[PDB]
Every structure is written in C-alpha cells, then in structure tokens.
Amino acid sequence: EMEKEFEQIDKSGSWAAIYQDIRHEASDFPSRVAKLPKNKNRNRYRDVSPFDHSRIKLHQEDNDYINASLIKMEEAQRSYILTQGPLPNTVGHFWEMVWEQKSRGVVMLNRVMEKGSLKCAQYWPQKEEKEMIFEDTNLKLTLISEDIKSYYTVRQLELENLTTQETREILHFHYTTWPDFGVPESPASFLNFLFKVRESGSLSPEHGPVVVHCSAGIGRSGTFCLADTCLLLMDKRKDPSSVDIKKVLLEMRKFRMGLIQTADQLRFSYLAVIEGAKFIMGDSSVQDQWKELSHED
Numbered sequence: 370e371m372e373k374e375f376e377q378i379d380k381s382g383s384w385a386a387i388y389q390d391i392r393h394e395a396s397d398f399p400s401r402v403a404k405l406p407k408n409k410n411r412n413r414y415r416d417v418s419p420f421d422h423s424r425i426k427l428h429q430e431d432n433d434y435i436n437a438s439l440i441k442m443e444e445a446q447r448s449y450i451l452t453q454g455p456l457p458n459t460v461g462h463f464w465e466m467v468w469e470q471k472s473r474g475v476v477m478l479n480r481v482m483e484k485g486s487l488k489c490a491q492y493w494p495q496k497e498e499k500e501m502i503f504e505d506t507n508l509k510l511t512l513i514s515e516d517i518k519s520y521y522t523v524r525q526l527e528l529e530n531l532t533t534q535e536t537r538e539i540l541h542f543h544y545t546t547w548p549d550f551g552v553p554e555s556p557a558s559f560l561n562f563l564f565k566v567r568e569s570g571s572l573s574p575e576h577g578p579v580v581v582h583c584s585a586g587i588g589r590s591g592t593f594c595l596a597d598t599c600l601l602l603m604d605k606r607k608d609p610s611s612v613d614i615k616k617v618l619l620e621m622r623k624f625r626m627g628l629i630q631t632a633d634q635l636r637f638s639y640l641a642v643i644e645g646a647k648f649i650m651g652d653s654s655v656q657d658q659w660k661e662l663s664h665e666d
C-alpha cells in the first residue's frame with residue numbers, strides 16, 4: 370500500500386532519493402525534430418523537447434512541429450496531450466492542434482505571469498466582444514462565458530474553422546493558485562479541480578485527448594495526469610494496493626521527458642492519490658468536503 374510507503378519515505382525523509390532513482394530509470398528517446406534549427410523559435414525551453422515517437426504533428430505541409438506529446442495510458446484507456454505554454458509566435462499552432470486532435474478541454478495550471486516573468490502568451494480572449502483571429506492557421510476564438518472560483522476559472526470558448534465555418538465548444542479549465550516548481554495549497558483544491566475536469570466530459574473517450582499545459586508542460590502538468598491515471602486504475606481494480614505510482618510515472622516518462630520536476634511534486638502526487646482514494650473506494654460525501662476545504666466560494 371502507497372499510504373504505508375508514504376509514511377516510510379516521509380519518516381526516513383527519502384523523497385529526494387526516490388526522486389533520483391526515477392530520474393535514473395527514466396526513458397531517453399531521440400528528439401531530433403525538436404532540435405532542427407528551423408524549430409528553435411517553436412520551443413520555450415532549450416532543455417524540454419518532445420520525443421519524436423510521441424510528438425503531435427500539425428497537419429500543415431510547411432512545418433508540422435509543435436512542442437506537444439501524446440501520453441497514451443493503455444490500461445486506463447486515457448490519453449493526454451502535454452504541451453508548453455504557447456509562445457507569441459505559436460498561439461495559432463496551439464489552436465490548430467486543439468482543432469486537429471478534436472480536444473474538448475484545455476487544462477492550464479499556471480498564471481500568465483509568475484515570479485515577475487511571462488510564463489505563457491495570453492492565448493484566449495479576455496472579453497466576449499473582442500474575439501481573436503489567428504491569421505496563420507485560419508481560426509477564430511470567441512469567449513462565450515467565464516465562471517470564476519477563488520483559485521480557478523472555467524471558460525466556455527467557441528473555436529471556428531474560418532476555412533469550413535465549422536464551430537466547436539472548447540472548455541478552458543484554469544487552475545489559478547499553483548506556483549512553478551511548487552505544489553497546490555492542499556490535495557483538496559487540486560482534487561476538486563480534477564473532478565470538475567472529469568465531470569465536463571473533457572477526459573472521456575468520445576473526445577480527442579485533453580490538452581494539459583503549465584510553463585514547460587512537465588511539472589504541474591505531470592502531477593495532473595499522474596493523479597488522474599492512478600485514480601482511474603485504482604477505480605478499475607478497486608484495489609489501492611495494486612497501484613504503484615512510481616511505475617505509472619515511469620510509463621508516462623516513456624512519452625514525455627521530465628514529468629514531475631521536483632521531489633515535492635512527487636510527494637504531492639502521492640498525497641493527491643491517497644486522499645482521492647477515499648472517493649474511489651465509495652465515500653461519495655468526501656467530494657463535498659473537498660469543495661468546502663478548497664473555499665472555491
């Protein structure tokens with residue numbers, strides 16, 4: 370059981386040690402396309418690249434490259450696209466990807482500005498009456514509605530293919546109180562947020578994969594899909610002891626490098642899964658307690 374493993378590592382203070390064993394066992398696959406000189410301005414960080422085998426390709430003849438990976442969790446029947454925060458010159462590529470992959474949800478785990486620096490381009494509209502047009506990819510994006518909670522925001526967006534006049538509704542889930550290289554206030558507000566994404570249908574197999582990002586798309590983004598996948602596996606087998614979070618994280622690291630960036634993100638992931646297991650194990654009321662503790666009202 371992970372809860373016992375949790376106490377052993379906590380009492381022995383071994384998080385930095387567990388974390389280094391994961392770093393050392395992690396997959397290394399080629400990322401040749403990311404490193405082509407024509408793609409240097411498509412990468413936010415020189416040291417965070419998609420592997421060639423799992424990279425998302427844009428359907429455009431000129432240049433198919435975006436810093437985005439498909440993470441396919443076969444047993445859980447869940448897919449995720451993990452990506453960087455869009456750059457000023459890749460906002461059009463970002464929405465082209467959302468369109469082409471048939472995604473229903475975008476999960477954003479960072480603020481546009483953190484620690485006095487820009488972590489992400491402002492890639493969605495701030496007011497209903499001021500829509501965004503991406504000339505390079507022929508898409509229009511309108512803000513339909515915005516629901517603000519204390520520490521996250523849910524936006525309904527309309528994406529229009531200007532080439533075919535097709536429209537889709539995209540849900541933007543914005544977690545607004547999670548610091549870079551840090552961990553949420555408590556497992557409670559993070560779990561409340563993850564359950565809200567699930568409730569929307571955005572993670573369901575009748576849609577394309579959810580798009581998840583932070584600044585690099587590996588740390589905070591990693592924590593989100595590790596907790597979701599672990600809870601679904603636990604669900605699927607109704608056995609908390611059957612789930613090894615270290616093995617799931619290594620399986621995810623076959624698809625994108627660096628998922629979970631610090632030992633505290635790793636400890637946070639264990640905590641989130643352990644608390645989440647209360648619900649998965651048949652205590653429905655725990656979901657209402659999370660909503661209370663998160664103080665979203």
Ligand SMILES: O=C(O)COc1cccc(Cl)c1
Pocket residue numbers: 414416417548549550551583584585586587588589590630
């Ligand atoms: O997602 C996080 O919390 C941390 O991830 C990173 C942020 C910026 C740069 C790099 Cl290399 C990683």
